[PDB]
Amino acid sequence: NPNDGYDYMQHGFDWPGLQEGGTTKYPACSGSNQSPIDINTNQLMEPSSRSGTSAVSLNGLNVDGAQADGITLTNAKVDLEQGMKVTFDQPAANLPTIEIGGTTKSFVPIQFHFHHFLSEHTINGIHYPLELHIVMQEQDPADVATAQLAVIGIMYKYSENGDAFLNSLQTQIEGKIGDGTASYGDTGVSIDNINVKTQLLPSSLKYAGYDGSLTTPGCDERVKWHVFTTPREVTREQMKLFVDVTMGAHAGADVVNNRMIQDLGDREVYKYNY
Numbered sequence: 001n002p003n004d005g006y007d008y009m010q011h012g013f014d015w016p017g018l019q020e021g022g023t024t025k026y027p028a029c030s031g032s033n034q035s036p037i038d039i040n041t042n043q044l045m046e047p048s049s050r051s052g053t054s055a056v057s058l059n060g061l062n063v064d065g066a067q068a069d070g071i072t073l074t075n076a077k078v079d080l081e082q083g084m085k086v087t088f089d090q091p092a093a094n095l096p097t098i099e100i101g102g103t104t105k106s107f108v109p110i111q112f113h114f115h116h117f118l119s120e121h122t123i124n125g126i127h128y129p130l131e132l133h134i135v136m137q138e139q140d141p142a143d144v145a146t147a148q149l150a151v152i153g154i155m156y157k158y159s160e161n162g163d164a165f166l167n168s169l170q171t172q173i174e175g176k177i178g179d180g181t182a183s184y185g186d187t188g189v190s191i192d193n194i195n196v197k198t199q200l201l202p203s204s205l206k207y208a209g210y211d212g213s214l215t216t217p218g219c220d221e222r223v224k225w226h227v228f229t230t231p232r233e234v235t236r237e238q239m240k241l242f243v244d245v246t247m248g249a250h251a252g253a254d255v256v257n258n259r260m261i262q263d264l265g266d267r268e269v270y271k272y273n274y
């Protein structure tokens, strides 16, 4: 019930073949620059060998939000259903940039969401219990439907010590469910402002970048991926929030919402800040 024309029962294995009225529903899900992928750290190439795309200048994302040129996601809201999407007022200053096809472009964070219980990307063949995707869109694109996107992927490994931001989100949500001001399935539920640098970015800026796609249909190949290789931490107790919210919203929802890894094909993956 959460997604419309597809689900995660086969982790997307079925997506490229779905047809309706003898017409293929998601032709781009069969492309050759699909995401997610495995990140083999011993095979990462040097950034200068990547044609057409530079490292991201994190700018305001990597400056304490309390600072003048630090970004704070404001008027933040979370959807109480699978993926727990968080939306907020569009940042307009200190935007991160990426030089693409020779042009430096600014990127605007538009939402962030989660892939819970199994990560979409793997690092050296290993999955993480949680992967956060901060989705950014190039500023003023020609058409929003075909806009260049940049996504930041952040992993969380199981640990005996949970993450601070996840704790706050869990506390806020569990509190609103408890006092009746929010119900599972509600969308755009208010939550506290978020300090990108202190609450979301991991402890090291090391990341793997490559050319990829959306990991949900239509799988459009318009994403510059930045997968940070140092994980944050999460406890099984914090992971319970995702099940409660996901099944509380739709009894038929898939609690493990990861698309399977895809063929790298002729792409290389590059290492940044190593």
Ligand code: NA
Binding pocket: 064, 065, 066, 067, 068, 069, 070, 071, 072
């Ligand atoms: Na600030």
Ligand SMILES: [Zn+2]
Binding pocket: 113, 114, 115, 133, 215
């Ligand atoms: Zn995602």
